[PDB]
Symmetry: D3
Subunit: 156 residues, 6 copies
């Protein structure tokens, strides 16, 4: 039995992009996940338009509405909310997604790189989370039996 996820992860910095690649490698190796039918944002850009190459779309409200809608739709139609979370580079966008996931009754799992696990995270991030784990535990996490636990680290 496999569960699908929403791949909540930033792609703006070096530490973010590192964590992204690690978490995606982890999922490819996790037998409880259906990655092919999961919602990965970067593979679901509206009408395939790459906003790096056409920044004129940052002032287009239809572009924004669809992208925003598609990402929410990604969360609500999948089983688990995954949040790749960097403590020194905390993301207001991911913050919002975690709130939305809560409201749609999803398990919220945060994944922190092991080099950073233990470091202080925002109180509300701590709170929305059902659990938070090290990146090394993601390859083996049992998504069929997901459970509540506390972060073993600081919170501000």
């Amino acid at each position: 039995p496999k569960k699908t996820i929403y791949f909540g992860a930033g792609w703006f910095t070096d530490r973010q992009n590192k964590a992204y690649k690690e978490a995606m490698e982890a999922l490819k190796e996790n037998p409880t996940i259906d990655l092919e039918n999961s919602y990965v944002p970067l593979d679901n850009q509206y009408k395939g338009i790459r906003v790096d190459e056409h920044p004129e779309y940052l002032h287009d409200k239809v572009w924004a509405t669809a992208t925003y809608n598609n990402d929410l739709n990604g969360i609500k139609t999948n089983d688990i909310m995954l949040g790749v979370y960097i403590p020194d580079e905390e993301d207001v966008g991911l913050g919002m997604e975690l709130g939305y996931a809560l409201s749609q009754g999803k398990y919220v799992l945060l994944v922190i790189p092991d080099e950073d696990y233990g470091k202080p995270i925002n109180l509300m991030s701590w709170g929305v989370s059902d659990n938070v784990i090290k990146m090394s535990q993601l390859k083996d996490f049992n998504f069929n039996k997901p459970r509540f636990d506390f972060y073993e680290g600081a919170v501000y």
Copy 2:
């Protein structure tokens, strides 16, 4: 005559944040549609009146975190409007979450950006949860009895 209460969503972690905080609070004091005395201000409602900047021993205390987290949620759900003091270059993951929770509890979500920054690009998901976004100089006068959807007059990254 009719007054609404708010939840004062705002960071206090940087200089620009602290500045925005002071400005927005002065704004509300002067707004005749707001009951500020019965509004929820987080910093006045941390568990046992203690903040972890001033008492770092509480960084690892799970009782303090549980109650503070719960009280902040309780603040959002029992007040009429969700207010988010928002700095575009210093966006807060905490406030991000609060905006989502406010959405789920059916509150008007209003962002307030300092005038010096209004127009600057904001995160897509912040744009989206928002019902409306205004300059800090509009906050003294905003009519909270007739709150409306509008699009931000600025970019989104």
Copy 3:
């Protein structure tokens, strides 16, 4: 003394609808439990004040649709009661949706049927979302501070 605000759910697409609209609005003006000045009337809150009956160029405009749709939702969620002016022979898919959304946001859903039609069969799902349904002549006097569940005195098809 205590007053509630409403969302004025009503079609404007037919003659009977437009008649019902005018009657219900006069009713609310005279109801002492309602604050009509701070209530949400859709027709006064379309995006950019423009309606697509009067400006058909907006039929294919997605910005206009997004904002109007959002503002109507915002109208429901930030007011106390969901009011649905309901014609049984001219039932509105738009109002149908609004009734569902109001349910999800925990509002009292009140239907008002013109007296000439009260008793006529209404759609099952409209019956079901409703907390209560009344004749137009009851609307001037309805006590919105003590709203109650009751069954429609009529059929359902």
Copy 4:
């Protein structure tokens, strides 16, 4: 992997009944759907009583409560909300179901007959929808990867 649906469709008119038969034929041929475990209203009439043959049940409040409850239960316990939507014969009942589906966090898909696709639909119908498609696209729609898109047609 198969998803289940709620078959939201009127049966009161000729155009409605045509659309019904087409959409059901479409689903029978769609490999991403489990139709056997989907909720089809007309196959789930309370205590098998046919209201055509016994209209005395239209004044029975217990009959109405159960039917109304069963239909909502149909929406909440299935994966996708399907709405067969005729633009010239818009249904207040379907309208309500779409709102309920939104509130229960389901993908809302509308299906319009191709002869009608493009014609004006109500604004709120447009809004609740995650996507709207032509009847001919239903046989092949991928329900494992459902996405946000705008109707390519008018709205009042």
Copy 5:
């Protein structure tokens, strides 16, 4: 000046329950933050004014059950605070459900325990749904305009 309305969650099935009921109602009469006249009291809002203790013929009536059940839900969702008069040795499955429903509709959930019993262990899930729990002698004076999360000063079994 600002007043909130409540839903009077309380059993009436035992002597201790009936005692607690009378005490809590006297408390609210004297609380200046409450509008009791516009609050929802279940016992005054059963379908057709009839209670099944006094008319056991209604034990098997599904119309009576549907409307009463609906009206009780409607009571919770259209009032500001969820109040639960709670006896630890006589815990009520009905009130248990109401507390959950109140949570889902985003209401402050306040439990009131008789002073003679405050401190006694309460069910885990009751503890958890609750925002706060107080002694009956605190109820006359509780400020419902500034309701806060707090932990019960007692055990949980």
Copy 6:
């Protein structure tokens, strides 16, 4: 196709413990249920601590928070809410869980021992329920096609 459940059942009395064992035997024999990936509270005690043997944990707020959270998490991440319901020993805890299940859009099924089916149940328990059945019908209940029905018994 199998659905998972949350095993809502008391363990404090003789009648409760009897009903528990019967309902669990029933599920083991039901082909529509995945019991291995269901949430059974007693197998999910926080950090394996047995509160019978260490009652000092009844005054620990972290223990309570995690247990309470894990049980809610159990309800929200499974498909069906099962409530083993004894009419003479009605549980305020189960009451709350049923409300939560409703709010998360789950089918709520109550199971009453046959020796008790028919006996009066609380109005609000009746109301939250989508259906209520005899313990003997649980071995064969079709959880892929769950439907609305009324309790055939009294309510106070």
